[PDB]
Amino acid sequence: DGTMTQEDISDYVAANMKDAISRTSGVGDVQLFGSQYAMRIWMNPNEL
Amino acid sequence: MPNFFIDRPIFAWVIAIIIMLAGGLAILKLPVAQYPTIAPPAVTISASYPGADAKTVQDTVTQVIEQNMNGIDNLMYMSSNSDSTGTVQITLTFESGTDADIAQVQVQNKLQLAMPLLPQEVQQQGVSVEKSSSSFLMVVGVINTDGTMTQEDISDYVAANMKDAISRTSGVGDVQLFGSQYAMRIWMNPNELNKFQLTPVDVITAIKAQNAQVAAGQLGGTPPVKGQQLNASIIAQTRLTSTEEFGKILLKVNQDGSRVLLRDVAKIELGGENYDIIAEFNGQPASGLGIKLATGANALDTAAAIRAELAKMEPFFPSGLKIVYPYDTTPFVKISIHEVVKTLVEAIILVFLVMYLFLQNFRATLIPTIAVPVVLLGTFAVLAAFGFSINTLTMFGMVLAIGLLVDDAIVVVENVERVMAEEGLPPKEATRKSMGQIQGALVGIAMVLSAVFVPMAFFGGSTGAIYRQFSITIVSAMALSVLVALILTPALCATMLKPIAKGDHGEGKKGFFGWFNRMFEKSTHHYTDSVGGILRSTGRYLVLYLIIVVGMAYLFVRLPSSFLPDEDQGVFMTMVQLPAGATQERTQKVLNEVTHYYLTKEKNNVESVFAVNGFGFAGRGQNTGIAFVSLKDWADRPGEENKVEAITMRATRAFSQIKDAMVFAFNLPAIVELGTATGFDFELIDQAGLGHEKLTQARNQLLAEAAKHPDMLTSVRPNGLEDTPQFKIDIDQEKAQALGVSINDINTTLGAAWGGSYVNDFIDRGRVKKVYVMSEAKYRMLPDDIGDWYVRAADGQMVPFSAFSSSRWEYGSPRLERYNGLPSMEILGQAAPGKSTGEAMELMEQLASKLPTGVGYDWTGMSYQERLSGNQAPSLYAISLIVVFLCLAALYESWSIPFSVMLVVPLGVIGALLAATFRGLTNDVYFQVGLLTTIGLSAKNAILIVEFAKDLMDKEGKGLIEATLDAVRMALRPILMTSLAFILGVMPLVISTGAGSGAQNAVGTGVMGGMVTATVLAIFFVPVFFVVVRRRFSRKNEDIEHSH
Ligand SMILES: CCCCCCCCCCCCO[C@@H]1O[C@H](CO)[C@@H](O[C@H]2O[C@H](CO)[C@@H](O)[C@H](O)[C@H]2O)[C@H](O)[C@H]1O
Ligand SMILES: CCCCCCCCCCCCO[C@@H]1O[C@H](CO)[C@@H](O[C@H]2O[C@H](CO)[C@@H](O)[C@H](O)[C@H]2O)[C@H](O)[C@H]1O
């Protein structure tokens, strides 16, 4: 429904789904096809 | 075999002696325990963050470790607490049968990934991973009987001299010190610090520099110059060892050259690493070690190892120091088992006595008497082969097997007896003939009877090992019983029985016993025509049976059910929980009242009280405590009023008067990890990052709605703590930069002073110990004290905290819970009276579904345990019933005749239900194993009636009704032998008082009542069962008198 971008969906599963799926019965490794959100500080060398 | 050993009596004995030797050895080596291990393994991660509040702990430590917990085999769930003591505990619970070594290995491999990510101070406190039970195995207490050592002295002696060796002992999963090791305590004074323009940063820097152990190499060290003749270690700074040495640490040298020493800005003493835990033994200063049993370890063995380690310490005790034993769960295991050994012996002697009453001959009753211990000792040897343990269920199997065993021995003796007593063969050929015609039956009937036990060897899950060990014991016994009946018993009849000849059973040559026979004689006829009159009956004697059956199913459903009964273990615990915010002093006030109560109002019952301030079931805190109560021996506490249930109820009622505290005494459940059996263990979950305040609100809503359903839910309560006032201080970053004060100096000053700081190590009497820096108590009690602390700016100025900060009161949590990596609150509760727990759980899930958005829930602990499909008895009893019918079909070569044996089943069940009902017992484990026993022996009685009736119709060719009669009690006398000897044999169980009598009383009255009814009733109904079945299932060209 157009509300969540791709970056958004990735954060949602990383933050709310992955950890429990990864403790679920018989689950070995779990690979996220995406990345969890971090606080992103994008620097500007000119303003610095 | 029977013939081979008849001609070889000594070979027979040799086999019996090897069997007994093997059993005897097993008894000396098998583990001993209350139950088979049914507890799921649980690995615990513990860490500490000195001075940290709960949210700091949770967000800086707990969340980090949890996010790293993945790819761990067999993990059922994970929970954790983070509290304002600075402490974390994360518990990972595994499926039953997980190898606890591997679980621990897998957990720690993940933890090691998280470690570099943890704060430096958490790492240096040491984080630990343990595999142990959650309850205490025992508490080893230590006092000083000359009062020449204080609480603190004792605690340090314990930590420094006893704890490590107890911690390294195999089977010891975890050890809690009730007290604290000494540390070098540097108690700072902010007045003097500021006087000399110093901060806690300077104090820390100086200690690290002047309490140092430096590596300085060697004179003439390798590689050396040629011709070197000297080589020696160079020794520089070494760790400081005394308060004097710390006192003279040089902070700085003034302008006029005067010296500022550490002792000029601080009081310096030995003192605990912490001051939270204070323990008393009967009101007297104490320390102790709370010991937890490692996953799967044997409790009795580990207790022994601990005792042995303790004994090695004692001679080197300082004067007055003494070990006391305030709380040990272990003697109850040893004593309760030995008490079952005592009733087992008594059962044998009582069987021997009833043997002798009927079979008057001493050598004839000595034969079954000999069989019993050969079979039972062999059975122990089998248990060993199967890796089982000597426990309550295997021991009960031994006792309950006796009826079955005795029957095999008597059937041989009696057949031989009344082969001699109806022809005239010497005992050697008399037994050969006799064995020739019963050995098939013997083997056969045992297979039919093992079928009533074998299916129940296959229960599943945690309840499963309980019935498996009982079932394998009985079936093992029954097997060996048949073995012995084919090997030893024929041999003993062939060599120990006296010849007879002449159609003999003799009335006149003894006194009392000759009378007994003569009564039984026409008692037998007064019985025979009783049957003959109830054979011309059939009509409404059938109807009575269907009344017993409906009365049986009626009595059944009325009877409540449970798993295992509470036992008086001679010990218990009292929990003390005050509101968060409560001071240590107030928790001591409450502990004093609890101690007082046991010391003065339970003099007859309570032997000692070991009370601990600052420790509770949920973990450390100023507002929590615990009392370990040891009781006087069971023999000095006669009657229900002096047992743990009435004692703890009385005590909880007294303590309910206590103001602003949660105080209650409770018996620890039979097994623990299964819970009191009306109780549910509920988890409320933040599923959408709602946060702690909103979660609290949803918890409150759930609790309120639950409260207005007392008809279904009772005692539904939060298991955690309530929010409390906290002091929020804001560092103003701008002012700090402006004044030139560094944030690291500010935070180290704030935290070192009010929280304490583990600086480095020093050496105390040869032992490495810690060094702590902290404000002296009087400068960290009041909010205004905050501004008395000063930090030094870059430009050398002293700036008071008040210049760069502001503060306010707010509310926060002192204990943050998480379940499966998500923020949670654990809610406890029980089903209301007359309601099932499942019904309470339902209502709970319904109540929970109407909770705000993003709030989920889960079941854990005991509630998890039984959602795990826990009701298999019916289908298993139905399978067992089916295999019994099939086996019986094989025995008689008929599809219909087995019915005449199987109709006996309700006749024994009605007795058990009635007995359990009238003694207010429950449908539990000891009720189910007891009834299979009764059904087994009631079956065996009925089988040998019908066995005779059929063989008199086929071999003799006699008519139906008339061969029933002859059949009917050619076997009464053996059936009354069998049954009455068993009934008087389980009697030590029913009249059992003392340790474990709860289980003995339980298992005993079920069997006794069942067997009493099973046999008095069947002896009139088995004659009926046979004839009614034989008519409904035709053959219209016999009845009346064949021969051939
Ligand atoms: C009718 C015959 C069958 C009935 C008899 C069965 C009784 C079973 C109950 C025994 C309970 C087990 O109790 C067990 O006893 C033996 C003997 O003390 C102990 O054995 C201990 O002492 C003996 C010497 O006395 C040593 O050989 C042994 O090294 C030592 O461990 C075991 O450590 C203990 O665990
Ligand atoms: C071959 C002859 C055999 C014929 C015998 C037929 C009569 C039936 C025998 C007794 C019936 C079994 O009794 C049954 O025990 C099971 C297993 O503990 C109980 O099950 C209950 O026990 C405990 C306590 O609540 C829980 O651990 C379990 O989750 C629960 O379901 C049932 O409430 C009860 O119905």
Short mmCIF file of C-alpha atoms in Angstrom, two decimals, chain A residues 12 15-16 18-20 22-30 36, chain B residues 66-72 75 78 95 687-689 820-822:
data_model
loop_
_atom_site.label_atom_id
_atom_site.label_comp_id
_atom_site.label_asym_id
_atom_site.label_seq_id
_atom_site.Cartn_x
_atom_site.Cartn_y
_atom_site.Cartn_z
CA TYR A 12 11.08 -3.84 10.05
CA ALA A 15 14.23 -5.27 14.03
CA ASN A 16 11.08 -7.32 14.63
CA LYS A 18 14.82 -11.84 12.27
CA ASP A 19 15.94 -12.45 15.88
CA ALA A 20 12.93 -14.69 16.68
CA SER A 22 16.70 -17.13 14.16
CA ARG A 23 15.79 -18.73 17.52
CA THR A 24 13.00 -20.81 15.98
CA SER A 25 13.18 -24.64 16.19
CA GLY A 26 15.61 -26.18 13.71
CA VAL A 27 16.71 -22.90 12.19
CA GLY A 28 20.42 -22.64 11.48
CA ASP A 29 21.79 -19.43 10.08
CA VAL A 30 19.52 -16.64 8.86
CA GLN A 36 18.65 -2.87 9.60
CA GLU B 66 20.15 -11.20 23.46
CA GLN B 67 20.55 -9.99 19.87
CA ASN B 68 23.54 -12.33 19.71
CA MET B 69 21.57 -15.36 20.88
CA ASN B 70 20.82 -17.22 17.65
CA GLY B 71 21.56 -20.58 16.11
CA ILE B 72 21.25 -22.30 19.44
CA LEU B 75 16.14 -23.63 22.72
CA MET B 78 14.74 -17.08 26.66
CA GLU B 95 14.27 -29.11 25.44
CA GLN B 687 5.22 -6.53 20.21
CA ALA B 688 5.42 -3.10 18.52
CA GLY B 689 8.00 -1.02 20.41
CA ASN B 820 12.28 -13.99 23.90
CA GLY B 821 14.19 -10.75 23.23
CA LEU B 822 11.11 -8.58 23.64
#
